[PDB]
Symmetry: C2
Subunit: 340 residues, 2 copies
């Protein structure tokens, strides 16, 4: 059932080995329509959680609403990259560089720092082709290029754009408060991996914000139109949101143009299904990506019970097999029956 | 019974993520010194019990016949990084028995340490079975077989004599019941048996003290525990928690990680064995937990206590080097 106020997270994902549960994850999920009505919840959807990268599409609204995306000729690939936690594959790097170039800037304008890919196969490619990663390899480089472009198009100096009272960060707080109805302030702020603010808010508000983006409900016309554009871009070019081997990219290849998903660090996922009018947010309590992936897939699957092929493809992510170094099947990562 | 929150991960002013888990600290006589959570539910030890699985290599006489020292014994007890020294040592152990890389049945994998992984990617097209974190343990298994003229082919199999012997050793050390219904296949394709954390901790306390063990098993157990503490690079490697934790108080603390958030440990001078599990399987939580549990026993040795608390409460810095939060064992470890 639905409890807006419980503080207790149920077991949402089991990891088996042999015939026994070896590890278990707890978590919380909110599913909300464009009007804010709760369709499904699990666990604590009231305590503030940090969305991390899961809200990058909300943070991309300045890039679109300012007219910068249109002025620089950005299409679906650039918008998807601005919404991305990308693998740092060379396609992502070259596209981020071209976004900066069109605004008259380069990698030196980035304030996010560098890191090696969090995808092991891409990390191996990076190690073999690079002495060290650059800021363009950072998973947030498309988001940050979007920030720099939003500033340059408006003649706002991008220097310091990560700072709490830089005009860009002022604007992003206002956007996020309006979309989500949450109160965003220093007491709920932390610093993200890319050195910008990240604001903790209840999962219910996060899901409602995505439901609004997906449906337009409660949004002024320009924000509704820009939200559609960002959601459609991510669904149209899902490699640019994540990349090779990544669950967000593959989830958005199951039912092309119909499902929006986005991961955040520490086990957050956000999602939306525009044709159903719904937004989803969730978090695995311990922060594991594998648990958040199984949870988002099991939650999405409930909306596709009438379409076997889509349902089966989503359930393949809700129940993932594990193989050891010899290829032997050893167990599975499975969403529990709370999702059924 | 719901396990308590053992580790909090903060960001800004707030707890961002939380881990639950269980810990058992048992003496050589089986008395429980300290526990958190449910220490009775069966848990897979994974690599945390490698030192128990190394007993055939020592007790059979194989280690002495092949001229093994503390480095080889530590490697037999290791989840190593697959650095060049680990690879060369596992190859050398196989060669003493008249075997080679082809005798290994564990498969190959890239290092689970990122810096070593980068070095491997730049120097190799692909890892070999020698790079597997379990290659020293498996070389030890093959040497135990060959020394006794047991055919090592199929040594991973449930009724191979080596696996029969390992079950008998581990049932004696831990008091647990091991059988097919509590068995799974581990990462290196051998059996791993789920057992209560209490029994696992008691087994390590028996290894560390000799209590309840026959003389040859007590002596071999002491040899293995001491080798690991004497050569802690060979148990794990550069950058690794198990190696650093065994460099804090040289010769005094034994630790061993297992996949899915297990740790085992022992403090021989206190007659203590330790086991624990992060319920969600996170390595970061198990590392903070083992450090905080060890710290309980060193509170009046300030330099040792401080170095253990540095693993119990770890800062997190972002890509620009800014402190963003912490990974901290909770107050239940100091209560
Ligand atoms: Cl609006
Ligand atoms: Cl994970
Ligand atoms: Cl007792
Ligand atoms: Cl015995
Ligand atoms: Zn970021
Ligand atoms: Zn192994």
């Amino acid at each position: 059932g639905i409890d807006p106020f419980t503080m207790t997270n149920p077991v949402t994902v089991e990891v088996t080995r042999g015939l026994l549960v070896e590890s278990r994850h707890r978590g919380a999920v909110a599913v909300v329509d464009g009007d804010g009505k709760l369709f499904f919840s699990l666990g604590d959807i009231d305590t503030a959680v940090f969305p991390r990268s899961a809200c990058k599409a909300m943070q991309a609204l300045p890039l679109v609403e300012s007219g910068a995306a249109d002025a620089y000729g950005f299409g679906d690939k650039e918008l998807a990259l601005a919404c991305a936690s990308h693998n740092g594959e060379e396609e992502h790097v070259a596209l981020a560089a071209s976004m900066l170039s069109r605004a008259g800037r380069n990698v030196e304008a980035l304030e996010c720092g560098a890191h090696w890919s969090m995808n092991q196969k891409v990390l191996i490619q990076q190690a073999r082709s690079l002495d060290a990663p650059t800021a363009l390899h950072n998973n947030c480089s498309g988001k940050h290029a979007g920030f720099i472009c939003a500033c340059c198009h408006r003649d706002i100096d991008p220097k310091g754009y990560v700072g709490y009272e830089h005009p860009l960060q002022v604007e992003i707080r206002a956007v996020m408060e309006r979309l989500t109805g949450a109160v965003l302030g220093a007491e709920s702020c932390g610093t993200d991996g890319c050195s910008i603010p990240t604001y903790a808010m209840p999962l219910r508000n996060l899901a409602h914000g995505f439901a609004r983006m997906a449906t337009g409900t409660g949004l002024e016309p320009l924000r509704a139109k820009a939200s559609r554009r960002l959601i459609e871009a991510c669904m149209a070019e899902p490699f640019y949101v994540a990349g090779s081997g990544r669950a967000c990219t593959k989830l958005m290849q199951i039912a092309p143009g119909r499902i929006f998903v986005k991961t955040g660090a520490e086990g957050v996922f956000c999602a939306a299904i525009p044709e159903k009018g719904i937004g989803i947010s969730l978090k695995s309590e311990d922060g594991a990506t594998r648990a958040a992936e199984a949870m988002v897939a099991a939650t999405l699957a409930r909306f596709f019970e009438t379409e076997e092929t889509v349902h089966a493809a989503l359930m393949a992510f809700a129940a993932m097999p594990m193989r050891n170094w010899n290829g032997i099947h050893v167990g599975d990562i499975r969403a529990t029956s709370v999702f059924s």
